[PDB]
Write a protein that binds this ligand. Structure first.
Ligand SMILES: [Mg+2]
Ligand SMILES: [Mg+2]
Ligand SMILES: [Mg+2]
Ligand SMILES: [Mg+2]
Ligand SMILES: [Mg+2]
Ligand SMILES: [Mg+2]
Ligand SMILES: [Mg+2]
Ligand SMILES: [Mg+2]
Ligand SMILES: [Mg+2]
Ligand SMILES: [Mg+2]
Ligand SMILES: [Mg+2]
Ligand SMILES: [Mg+2]
Ligand SMILES: [Mg+2]
Ligand SMILES: [Mg+2]
Ligand SMILES: [Mg+2]
Ligand SMILES: [Mg+2]
Ligand SMILES: [Mg+2]
Ligand SMILES: [Mg+2]
Ligand SMILES: [Mg+2]
Ligand SMILES: [Mg+2]
Ligand SMILES: [Mg+2]
Ligand SMILES: [Mg+2]
Ligand SMILES: [Mg+2]
Ligand SMILES: [Mg+2]
Ligand SMILES: [Mg+2]
Ligand SMILES: [Mg+2]
Ligand SMILES: [Mg+2]
Ligand SMILES: [Mg+2]
Ligand SMILES: [Mg+2]
Ligand SMILES: [Mg+2]
Ligand SMILES: [Mg+2]
Ligand SMILES: [Mg+2]
Ligand SMILES: [Mg+2]
Ligand SMILES: [Mg+2]
Ligand SMILES: [Mg+2]
Ligand SMILES: [Mg+2]
Ligand SMILES: [Mg+2]
Ligand SMILES: [Mg+2]
Ligand SMILES: [Mg+2]
Ligand SMILES: [Mg+2]
Ligand SMILES: [Mg+2]
Ligand SMILES: [Mg+2]
Ligand SMILES: [Mg+2]
Ligand SMILES: [Mg+2]
Ligand SMILES: [Mg+2]
Ligand SMILES: [Mg+2]
Ligand SMILES: [Mg+2]
Ligand SMILES: [Mg+2]
Ligand SMILES: [Mg+2]
Ligand SMILES: [Mg+2]
Ligand SMILES: [Mg+2]
Ligand SMILES: [Mg+2]
Ligand SMILES: [Mg+2]
Ligand SMILES: [Mg+2]
Lengths: 46, 93, 271
RNA sequence: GCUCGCCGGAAGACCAAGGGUUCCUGUCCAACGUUAAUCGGGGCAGGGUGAGUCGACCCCUAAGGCGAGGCCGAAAGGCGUAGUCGAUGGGAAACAGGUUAAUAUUCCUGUACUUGGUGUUACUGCGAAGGGGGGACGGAGAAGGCUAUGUUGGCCGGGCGACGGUUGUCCCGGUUUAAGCGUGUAGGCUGGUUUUCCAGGCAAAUCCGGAAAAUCAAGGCUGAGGCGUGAUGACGAGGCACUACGGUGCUGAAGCAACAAAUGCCCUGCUUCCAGGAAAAGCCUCUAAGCAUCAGGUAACAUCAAAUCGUACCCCAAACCGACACAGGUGGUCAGGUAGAGAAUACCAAGGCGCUUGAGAGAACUCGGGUGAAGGAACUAGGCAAAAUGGUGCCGUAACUUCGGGAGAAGGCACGCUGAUAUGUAGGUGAGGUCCCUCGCGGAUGGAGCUGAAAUCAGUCGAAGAUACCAGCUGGCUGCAACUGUUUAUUAAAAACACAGCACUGUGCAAACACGAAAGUGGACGUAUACGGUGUGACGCCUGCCCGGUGCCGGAAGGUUAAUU
RNA sequence: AGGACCGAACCGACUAAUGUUGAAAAAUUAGCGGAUGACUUGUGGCUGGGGGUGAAAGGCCAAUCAAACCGGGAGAUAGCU
């Protein structure tokens, strides 16, 4: 049975990557939120 | 021309292993741990100057570090560059 | 030529096809082609704005001369061609100076025919003249509505416009819909009717044939639920309401034209 | 190690995605592994991934994204121009052999190829953000020519058989060779060459397009494979000799032909159809402002350069997606033998496995199967399930029908093997010889050799010859839906949805309509033979009466009636 | 020629049995339908929550759908247990 998670590094980076987050005001807000919470990994990039 | 400082820094250590010995004995190729940012030209220049030998060609590859363990503490070794440099059968350095 | 297929399969029984022996069989004239990719009925917001569009055969766009602005230079018909972008056939024409163009092929236009545009052209099918220089009662197509804008009226296969009257700076046309419209007398028109009049006689014969043309199925409002159509709902076949569009406007007789700007140019509605 | 069993269009091999050291070696068995474990994809330590030619990076664009100015919008922002990104597509170049415990088109051996720079020489009108050509494109079908590959014969090496026979018409094994270069073949396309002129290609052009004459009509482009070379090389059964029994070194024969043949190649071709089948650059070419004995260009020779990143390992899976070492899912490539139409099926080759609890016993009952006296649907809601039919060739086949169908209707006969026809027929292929010349990868005759159906006649064995695997049950009456399709991912596949056709109605183009506070966009680079909405639902015969109610359309005399004043 | 026929791959899911603390949060086995087309499939892209998409089942929108998920108003309110 085909499940929901079908990995693709390019689609992952384009949908949730650092540059995609930086592209909009709301993505920058999520980055600021994660920095304030002190997440050790801001995005999916690594 | 590449300066003296760059060539003095690009060579880190001679590599030691069975494959290194086989290559040295057969194809007169020596194996070196070099700088991560060192290109084939810099490696050739540094070997020609600091070792005083003659070089045909340089082969390079990057070795990825191993993800290891130290008492329930994940740790990763660094990446390093490896160079197969062929000396033209006249020195036996 | 209209011919019906033999019923050697259920999908072929009712197929009626329009075959024209005189259309070109090779590839079209390449320097007059463009790419024309499909939209699916989506606008630049990405939303479906016109339903029932999608798929169908890949098509290339042919640049057609609707203006006919090369006055005074004769042109000869080189070949008739198939155009996937419109119901009419088009004709490649060669000008005396070495320039080639596509035009809408009028009825009776065949290879080797001679065409011309300008004020000093003969009253022959395929020739383009300002309507000031076209006799009253003529039959034209590719009719302009503004001078130099290009033809916009009577462009579909078998269509034509009759020049009913003429006075002053305007002429009175009778449109294909049955509407009387006033047009500036300096707008240009091509003599004759548009060709390929047997186009209405084709019978697609099966659903896939309409799918080849890029039209998706229509779902009746009475077959869905009231959350997504005013006609929806019911235990069995139920209607009990006045027919409307999916957005709630009455769809059997209610008029939607509202253009006070162009109302002055309409002598009488199609009725 | 020897037996046995299983897969073999995979349960073998190689890529892409995804994962990340799981790869190799030494060591260890606490925990992990559904048991034990000396073993492991477990722990610990060390080793391992070598590129001018493969891929990325790069040049070029698609869908789409972003977007200087700009237009729009309380703010935030939205759309979009010039631009600039964006592969799943276009664009230069490498093959064979050997080698590691683990890499190899990357290392080595041999032989190649591509693009750019620097110099020398010779000759010479070069030049782009511009023009032209090219790149450049669909479905289906058919033939012909090939190759991969296979079989057989010939040849070389070995053998003479644990039990009757086996010096032969016997048995086993091998019989391999690339890119590149030269030839330019089967075949596909198109008439060449030279002048003079011209409302076109935003300017110009010698280039493209167009007009008119002269002349010759065979020239030009593309092209699998074959042959030669590459290659006296490499590889090679086997033997000789060591081995710490893994493996190491050398020697090393033959290394041909015929036939058969792909879904691969010629072919981005040919024929045909309608639903009419990317873009841009690399490339060739034309000139412009300009430069003008400089630059630039053509060609030969030499030298230099080709950086950086990836490269281990799994990849139908115990390493990816499924919480698991989970009967699930996962795109592409390769494709042997015998039988067979076949990538079905059965048994096998190469190669890979026996699925990480076993040992006994031989109760009821459950699961998966085999057989069954006599009866044959009496079972049951219902023939559910099971049983049965099942191939090829030939004969034969009803009502009805939209004349296609129905139809494989139904039903019936033959089928193995041996010999002869005929020491191998019909056919296919095709050498030597001979003849001709545009002399060659040419042609005409020649038929050796090879391969080889189908049938007829006789004979013969069994209970049975489509003997296994494989492989339609058939017929009659009737409701519904015309038909192929679609649907409740995970209790409903249908009579439901769609459908071709029919009708009503809107819409004159800045269209109606839809998404949008708007700018704009789709409709549509379409124009009433078009587009939207609604109902009905192939086809045949048809579709009767009612406008009082509600809606919609038309009208604007009279009554009423907002802001306003 | 064909939304033609029989039939593998491939795509589906009509029947029965098993399984139901499963090998599996939808499968296995034996049969079954389509199989050149309104086909199927890889890669990438677009549509966003009173919104999308829907050959229309209130189907689907990450094991969630008559209004997704996450965070917030928030200790909503609860004549009820
Ligand atoms: Mg090298
Ligand atoms: Mg519609
Ligand atoms: Mg319809
Ligand atoms: Mg319903
Ligand atoms: Mg409603
Ligand atoms: Mg009712
Ligand atoms: Mg009622
Ligand atoms: Mg590890
Ligand atoms: Mg291992
Ligand atoms: Mg123990
Ligand atoms: Mg244990
Ligand atoms: Mg390990
Ligand atoms: Mg490298
Ligand atoms: Mg763009
Ligand atoms: Mg934008
Ligand atoms: Mg701006
Ligand atoms: Mg770019
Ligand atoms: Mg690509
Ligand atoms: Mg390996
Ligand atoms: Mg061969
Ligand atoms: Mg095929
Ligand atoms: Mg590898
Ligand atoms: Mg297991
Ligand atoms: Mg599994
Ligand atoms: Mg699949
Ligand atoms: Mg099989
Ligand atoms: Mg038992
Ligand atoms: Mg039993
Ligand atoms: Mg039985
Ligand atoms: Mg019995
Ligand atoms: Mg009996
Ligand atoms: Mg009986
Ligand atoms: Mg009974
Ligand atoms: Mg009973
Ligand atoms: Mg049954
Ligand atoms: Mg049975
Ligand atoms: Mg016989
Ligand atoms: Mg009844
Ligand atoms: Mg039906
Ligand atoms: Mg059906
Ligand atoms: Mg269901
Ligand atoms: Mg079902
Ligand atoms: Mg518009
Ligand atoms: Mg209906
Ligand atoms: Mg079919
Ligand atoms: Mg079938
Ligand atoms: Mg389905
Ligand atoms: Mg099944
Ligand atoms: Mg069928
Ligand atoms: Mg309902
Ligand atoms: Mg769901
Ligand atoms: Mg709600
Ligand atoms: Mg509150
Ligand atoms: Mg509370």
């Amino acid at each position: 049975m085909k499940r929901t998670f079908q990995p693709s590094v390019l689609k992952r980076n384009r949908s949730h990557g650092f540059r995609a987050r930086m592209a909009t005001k709301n993505g920058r807000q999520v980055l600021a939120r994660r920095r304030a919470k002190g997440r050790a990994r801001l995005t999916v990039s690594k | 021309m590449i300066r003296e400082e760059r060539l003095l820094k690009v060579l880190r250590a001679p590599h030691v292993s069975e494959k290194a010995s086989t290559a040295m004995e057969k194809s007169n190729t020596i194996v070196l741990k070099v700088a991560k940012d060192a290109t084939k030209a810099e490696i050739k220049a540094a070997v020609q100057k600091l070792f005083e030998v003659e070089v045909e060609v340089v082969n390079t590859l990057v070795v990825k570090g191993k993800v290891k363990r130290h008492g329930q503490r994940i740790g990763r070794r660094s990446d390093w560059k490896k160079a197969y440099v062929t000396l033209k059968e006249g020195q036996n350095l | 030529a209209v011919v019906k297929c033999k019923p050697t399969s259920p999908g072929r029984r009712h197929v009626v096809k329009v075959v024209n022996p005189e259309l070109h069989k090779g590839k079209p004239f390449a320097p007059l082609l463009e790419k024309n990719s499909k939209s699916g009925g989506r606008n630049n917001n990405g939303r479906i704005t016109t339903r029932h569009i999608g798929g169908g055969h890949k098509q290339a766009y042919r640049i057609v001369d609707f203006k006919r602005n090369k006055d005074g230079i004769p042109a000869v018909v080189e070949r008739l061609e198939y155009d996937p972008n419109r119901s009419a056939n088009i004709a490649l024409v060669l000008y005396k100076d070495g320039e080639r163009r596509y035009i809408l092929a009028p009825k009776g236009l065949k290879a080797g025919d001679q065409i011309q545009s300008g004020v000093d052209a003969a009253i022959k099918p395929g020739n383009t003249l300002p309507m000031r220089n076209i006799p009253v009662g003529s039959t034209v197509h590719n009719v302009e509505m503004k001078p130099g804008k290009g033809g916009q009226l009577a462009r579909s296969a078998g269509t034509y416009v009759q020049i009913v009257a003429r006075d002053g700076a305007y002429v009175t046309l009778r449109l294909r819909s049955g509407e009387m419209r006033k047009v500036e007398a300096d707008c240009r028109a091509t003599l004759g009717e548009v060709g390929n009049a047997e186009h209405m006689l084709r019978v697609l014969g099966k659903a896939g044939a309409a799918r080849w043309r890029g039209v998706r199925p229509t779902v009746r409002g009475t077959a869905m639920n009231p959350v997504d159509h005013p006609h929806g709902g019911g235990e069995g076949r139920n209607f009990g309401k006045h027919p409307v569009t999916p957005w709630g406007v009455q769809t059997k007789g209610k008029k939607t034209r509202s253009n006070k700007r162009t109302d002055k140019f309409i002598v009488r509605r199609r009725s």
